[PDB]
């Protein structure tokens, strides 16, 4: 699936990241447009032996279990399939235990390449909510 801002906006609202951990609604759909352009089934296939997988281009070394890459962690606990789902709970989810361990939105490189002290709140103007 790939999402409008404003429907990613909404979804992404309804599962509480509005202001998790001091980020901004906005910050989250600016990450989500430059890692994956919006969309769900995105992957990166890295020459490390490593996958980015799905709207906010999760990796599979620390993150989630795709069974072929050297060092896993799988600190969200999850196969990497799962943040392939049309519905984004799961990256969601993920996202937020990245945080949770020791991370600002610096751990995304698109958030602190594109996103950082721009107008993220473009991303949610003019938006119905
Ligand atoms: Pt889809
Ligand atoms: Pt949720």
């Known amino acids: ?6 429907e990613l906006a909404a979804a992404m ?6 202001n998790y951990r001091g980020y901004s609604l906005g910050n989250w759909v600016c990450a989500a447009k430059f890692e994956s352009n919006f969309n769900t089934q995105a992957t990166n296939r890295n020459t490390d032996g490593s ?8 990796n599979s070394r620390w993150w989630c279990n795709d069974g072929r890459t050297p060092g896993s962690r799988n ?6 399939s799962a943040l392939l789902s049309s519905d984004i ?14 991370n600002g939105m610096n751990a ?19 938006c119905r909510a």
């Open 89 to 102: 709970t799961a990256s969601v989810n993920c996202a937020k235990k990245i945080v949770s361990d020791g």
């Open 51 to 58: 996958t980015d997988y799905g709207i906010l281009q999760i």
């Open 75 to 80: 600190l969200c606990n999850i196969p990497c």
């Open 1 to 6: 699936k790939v999402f409008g801002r404003c």
């Open 108 to 126: 995304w490189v698109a958030w602190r390449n594109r996103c950082k002290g721009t107008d993220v709140q473009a991303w949610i103007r003019g």
């Open 13 to 18: 609202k309804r599962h509480g990241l509005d």
